Swiss-Prot record, chain B:
Keyword check for Zinc: yes
Organism in which the protein naturally occurs: Saccharomyces cerevisiae (strain ATCC 204508 / S288c)
Name of this chain's protein: DNA-directed RNA polymerase II subunit RPB9
InterPro entries per UniProt: DNA-dir_RNA_pol-M_15_CS (IPR019761), Rpa12/Rpb9/Rpc10/TFS (IPR012164), Zn_ribbon_RPB9 (IPR001529), Zn_ribbon_RPB9_C (IPR034012), Znf_TFIIS (IPR001222)
Other notes: Present with 2440 molecules/cell in log phase SD medium.
Zn finger intervals (TFIIS-type): 71-111
Family statement: Belongs to the archaeal RpoM/eukaryotic RPA12/RPB9/RPC11 RNA polymerase family.
Lineage: Eukaryota, Fungi, Dikarya, Ascomycota, Saccharomycotina
Phosphoserine PTM sites in chain numbering: 40
Pfam families with a match to the protein in the record: Zn_ribbon_RPB9, Zn_ribbon_TFIIS
ZnF C4-type span: 7-32
UniProt keyword list: DNA damage, DNA repair, DNA-directed RNA polymerase, Metal-binding, Nucleus, Phosphoprotein, Transcription, Zinc, Zinc-finger
Subcellular localization(s) per the UniProt record: Nucleus, Nucleolus
UniProtKB/Swiss-Prot annotation, chain C:
Known role: DNA-dependent RNA polymerases catalyze the transcription of DNA into RNA using the four ribonucleoside triphosphates as substrates. Common component of RNA polymerases I, II and III which synthesize ribosomal RNA precursors, mRNA precursors and many functional non-coding RNAs, and small RNAs, such as 5S rRNA and tRNAs, respectively. Pol II is the central component of the basal RNA polymerase II transcription machinery. RNA polymerase complexes are composed of mobile elements that move relative to each other.
GO biological process: nucleolar large rRNA transcription by RNA polymerase I; ribosome biogenesis; RNA-templated transcription; termination of RNA polymerase I transcription; termination of RNA polymerase III transcription; transcription by RNA polymerase I; transcription by RNA polymerase II; transcription by RNA polymerase III
Keywords tagged on the record: DNA-binding, DNA-directed RNA polymerase, Nucleus, Ribosome biogenesis, Transcription
Main location: nucleus
Organism: Saccharomyces cerevisiae (strain ATCC 204508 / S288c) (Baker's yeast)
Organism superkingdom: Eukaryota
InterPro entries, per database record: Arch_Rpo5/euc_Rpb5 (IPR014381), RNA_pol_Rpb5_N (IPR005571), RNA_pol_Rpb5_N_sf (IPR036710), RNA_pol_subH/Rpb5_C (IPR000783), RNA_pol_subH/Rpb5_CS (IPR020608), RPB5-like_sf (IPR035913)
A matching Pfam family: RNA_pol_Rpb5_N
Keyword Transcription attributed: yes
UniProt keyword annotation of DNA-binding present: yes
Subcellular location: Nucleus
From Swiss-Prot, chain D:
Function recorded in the entry: DNA-dependent RNA polymerase catalyzes the transcription of DNA into RNA using the four ribonucleoside triphosphates as substrates. Second largest component of RNA polymerases II which synthesizes mRNA precursors and many functional non-coding RNAs. Proposed to contribute to the polymerase catalytic activity and forms the polymerase active center together with the largest subunit. Pol II is the central component of the basal RNA polymerase II transcription machinery.
Protein name (Swiss-Prot/TrEMBL): DNA-directed RNA polymerase II subunit RPB2
Assembly description: Component of the RNA polymerase II (Pol II) complex consisting of 12 subunits.
Other remarks on this protein: The binding of ribonucleoside triphosphate to the RNA polymerase II transcribing complex probably involves a two-step mechanism. The initial binding seems to occur at the entry (E) site and involves a magnesium ion coordinated by three conserved aspartate residues of the two largest RNA Pol II subunits.
Localisation per UniProt entry: Nucleus
Family: Belongs to the RNA polymerase beta chain family.
Disulfide bond sites: none
Swiss-Prot record, chain E:
Subcellular location: Nucleus
Biological role: DNA-dependent RNA polymerase catalyzes the transcription of DNA into RNA using the four ribonucleoside triphosphates as substrates. Largest and catalytic component of RNA polymerase II which synthesizes mRNA precursors and many functional non-coding RNAs. Forms the polymerase active center together with the second largest subunit. Pol II is the central component of the basal RNA polymerase II transcription machinery. During a transcription cycle, Pol II, general transcription factors and the Mediator complex assemble as the preinitiation complex (PIC) at the promoter.
Coiled-coil blocks: none
Per UniProt, location of the Glycyl lysine isopeptide (Lys-Gly) (interchain with G-Cter in ubiquitin) cross-link in this chain: 24
Upper classification of the organism: Eukaryota, Fungi, Dikarya, Ascomycota, Saccharomycotina
Family as reported in the entry's similarity comment: Belongs to the RNA polymerase beta' chain family.
PTM (free text): The tandem 7 residues repeats in the C-terminal domain (CTD) can be highly phosphorylated. The phosphorylation activates Pol II. Phosphorylation occurs mainly at residues 'Ser-2' and 'Ser-5' of the heptapeptide repeat. The phosphorylated form of Pol II appears to carry, on average, one phosphate per repeat. The phosphorylation state is believed to result from the balanced action of site-specific CTD kinases and phosphatases, and a 'CTD code' that specifies the position of Pol II within the transcription cycle has been proposed.
Domain of life: Eukaryota
Residue ranges of the region described as Bridging helix: 139-151
Amino acid sequence: THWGLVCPAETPEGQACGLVKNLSLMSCISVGTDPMPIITFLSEWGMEPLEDYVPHQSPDATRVFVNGVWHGVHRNPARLMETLRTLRRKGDINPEVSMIRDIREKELKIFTDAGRVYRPLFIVEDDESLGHKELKVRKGHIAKLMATEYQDIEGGFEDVEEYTWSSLLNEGLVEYIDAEEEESILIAMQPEDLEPAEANEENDLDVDPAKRIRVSHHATTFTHCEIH
Amino acid sequence: MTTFRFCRDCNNMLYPREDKENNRLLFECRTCSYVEEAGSPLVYRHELITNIGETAGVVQDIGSDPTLPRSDRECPKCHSRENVFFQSQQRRKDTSMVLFFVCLSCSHIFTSDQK
Amino acid sequence: MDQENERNISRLWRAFRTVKEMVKDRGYFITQEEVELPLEDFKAKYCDSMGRPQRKMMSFQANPTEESISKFPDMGSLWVEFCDEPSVGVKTMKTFVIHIQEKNFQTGIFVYQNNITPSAMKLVPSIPPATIETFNEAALVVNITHHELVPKHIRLSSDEKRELLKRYRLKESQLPRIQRADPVALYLGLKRGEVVKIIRKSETSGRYASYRICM
Amino acid sequence: GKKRLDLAGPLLAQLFKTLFKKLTKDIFRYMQRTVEEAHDFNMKLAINAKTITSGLK
Amino acid sequence: DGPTMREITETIAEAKKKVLDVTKEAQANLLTAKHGMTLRESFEDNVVRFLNEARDKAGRLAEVNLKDLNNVKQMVMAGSKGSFINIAQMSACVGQQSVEGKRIAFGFVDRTLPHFSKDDYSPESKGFVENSYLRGLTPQEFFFHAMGGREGLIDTAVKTAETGYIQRRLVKALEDIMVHYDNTTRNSLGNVIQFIYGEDGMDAAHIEKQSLDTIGGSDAAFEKRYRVDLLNTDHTLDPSLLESGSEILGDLKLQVLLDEEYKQLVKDRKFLREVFVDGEANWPLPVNIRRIIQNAQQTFHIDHTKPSDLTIKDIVLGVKDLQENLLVLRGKNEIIQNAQRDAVTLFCCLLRSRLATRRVLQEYRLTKQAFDWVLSNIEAQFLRSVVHPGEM
Amino acid sequence: LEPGHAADQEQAKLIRSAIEHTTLKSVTIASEIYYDPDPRSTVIPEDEEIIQLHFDQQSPWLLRLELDRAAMNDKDLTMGQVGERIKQTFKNDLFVIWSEDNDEKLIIRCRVVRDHMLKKIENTMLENITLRGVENIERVVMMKYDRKVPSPTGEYVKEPEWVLETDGVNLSEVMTVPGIDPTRIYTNSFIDIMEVLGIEAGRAALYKEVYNVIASDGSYVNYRHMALLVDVMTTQGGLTSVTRHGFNRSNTGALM
Ligand SMILES: [Zn+2]
Ligand SMILES: [Zn+2]
């Protein structure tokens, strides 16, 4: 579970080996957020309170946990999960908040406390135009980022209003994933794995014998991609 | 006890007892009598091995998990070329490595234990 | 019903053979033919008509004068008795003790079947200057001294012990110690203060001799 | 996913909570002492400043 | 070169195919379970065995392909640094990463890394590095290698302290053991723990491994190599070996001496067989007879053609005198004499084996002066190899 | 095994009947406390043919056991043997009936004549009623080892033999099992070696254990050092641990 959070082969040798750990690059720590807006959102969208919940005549109900506190049950977990994810990607909910859904355990957990370690990740969405899953970030965003990176050195006019990392987070192209959320997502090692699923299957091709031999593209249900 | 007998009155469960004179086992509550014939030979069942075909909760949203691997095994009933497979959920070394295939079209669970 | 009877007969025969071997190794007179007796004529000469084992199999030692009397002039006669009742109480060993007293035997060996009481154990060390030894059939099924890891143990006389102490210029406490409850010590019937010579094979020298004193 | 890291956040929060609890105890003792006559907080917080600075340092 | 890497890749692919076939067989419940273990343990053992065999085969192929001018290979032959496993991991393939003696455990829920699917038992997902250091490592195998290295570092860090404490305790336990002037080892209290040091009274630094020729071999070979009869002709002695040839035949004293020596030799063989059930012949012994006889052959130039000067009586008497001259206890009473006699039984057996009359008269052809020099050197070395009293 | 029956797989398998096969819990699948006041009749149609064959005496409570195919090999299809073992272990007024390997569904019927009394007796029959074997033994694995037995012609040759490896330490009772060699039985635990053997045997076992410990790194240690260590550890009549409770509790000087 230390992948992308703490640096491997960094701990000092001796009696502190494996105890003194250093944070990896592109790793942040949440500061904490009040969960009251999330509770109000859950109640408004339709969520049975725990007071009137009975386990009988309701075997498909999924328990909802906020900051480790059981608040009620939900009969339609998938739509609630989609709505919460859309709200988080739109900036309505703080990106530091982590929401995890357990399909088999029928549990939905939301954490808004502090001390959690998260790292940014790319977002993969289905593209009907290309007929296969593709990254939500395209060449236009890269061009805008490069233009705003080259603009500050020489100054200039308003340009694109300083398209920055906050703009990427607001647009939903990049989202924060902590250790808990990594338990129910599929991550592609490189964007080159987001090719068509067939990828010219059963077609022999020549490769460089001096290059690394790798195995990938075995799954077509990718949800995230590593930045690097 | 495969099933638990609950008193119709109140909500406590029923102790086992024998009528002696009638030579018939009867279940009786303690808050109230609630005497009935208790026509059930089952008094106690003990289990020692894992149940065959334990599978899991197999909720209707089992196909929405992106981490579940997919295969092309033929569905016995609907003859679909798509499904999701997972191993047994028992948490010890006694279980085998059999795979349970779940079709996302007809929600039918079929195993690969050809034997 | 035949399996248990055959198992008991075989165990009793093995225990009898081990007892005979122990008596022979202790320095008494036991013929080599009696040591290795076949099961068929053992059952013919013992047990009963129906095949039930019989515990009326007792022997008396002789203390041969060839080497045993010469080495230890104060060696008497030994009586070995097998208890018939399963669990030995206090009365049965009382009869055994007064039978030993009437027959003035120097040494007596009792072999119980399953268990023995603490009061029974307390009764045992009360006959001076004689000695009473208690053994278990389960422990006597297999001879310990026949194992490949058990070297030869030879008891040393008083003169030999004195000569060894004088030659090596050692005290009694300046010797390796062996517990009185050691299986080999019980096999040899070692007393307190006796010295036993141990000969074992070595990978650096062909032979090596070591001495231990019973404490 | 079941462990948290304590930055210069809740640690300083706990330190300040303990210091402020000591402050509340001291000022309550002073207020109880001053029931006879007069009540001035200008000098009652010299020890407040001393404790707040000293504990943190 | 290209063909070697192609062969390595083919071997790795074949191993992966075998692993996949094993997984498919196990998933269908068609794989029998070895007695004493469950299906999972047997499956894991088969997988790790296949992976290790593939890695070893690839490493052997890479080592074979390397030429004699290779610097790493040249260092390997010299033995100064490097090994076969280093060449394998550096050129052909890295071994399967293991933590706590098993493959990479499922840190996540039925997954090793978030980039894999659930219930994936393929070797790549469980920590098999099919690449090499020269080729480079993918991120997953890089993480697995980092985990293995961390486990190794933690193991050494714990082990150094544990062995240090163990060494301190062991030193404290035996810090007062003395070898005294009576060739007995005693503690501070004077209690005797060993009546003779090492059961032989020999210094550790003056012992060399030697082979006993009597224990090994067959009965016919032993008789041919040792039995000599001056009356019959089956094992007769060549008269040209010694100057007294054609005259020792028909004698009775020489014949009885020879058969007494043969009886002693077969008794020694029986004793050695009883002592060593496995029949091992290479055992450490104080004095190296072979070096002494080789030196005595190099000096006092042996013609290898002229008849020898030694007689049977001279050889037998010299051997007996050498046996009697070995002192390790120097006592007068019966007990010390017996201890000295039985503390040199192995050395006496070796000396009898290496100084037989037939061996001297056929292979180690020496003269009377050479034989006397050999005996004196053996006695001096044996007396100088005794443990000095007062050693800790 | 015995020297005569050394390379005999069948003899090794027969001797392997010393592992404690545990109670019926190792072979049963379920247990029932079915109530039936009728002694000679039962409500279960399956348990009727055996009652017909069979037919302070009436038992209103009935207890049933169901086994599986694991008894065919581990228990060598001991159909009546388990019933006889239950009879001897319980006795008193315990009415137990076992199917004679005839019906596919094997039922071990049990009854007792004088509902909580059935539970305790069933629990006791579940864990501490041994059928066959030696206690403190749970896994025996057969191996084919090679021994350098001298040839009749004089040379030394490798003679393969069957060796039984056990995961338990009960050598006090294992040595009494017929068909094995009591003069060659070895245990890696030297603590209980001198319980049945002598102190010298314990010292030899300890030396062998130490030599096996220093065997894998490839380092060679002279015999004198290890012999001295094991002699110091066994100077008295028992094991003397290298700790504060072992060699420390001696008569040496207080300062040292
Ligand atoms: Zn009621
Ligand atoms: Zn289907």
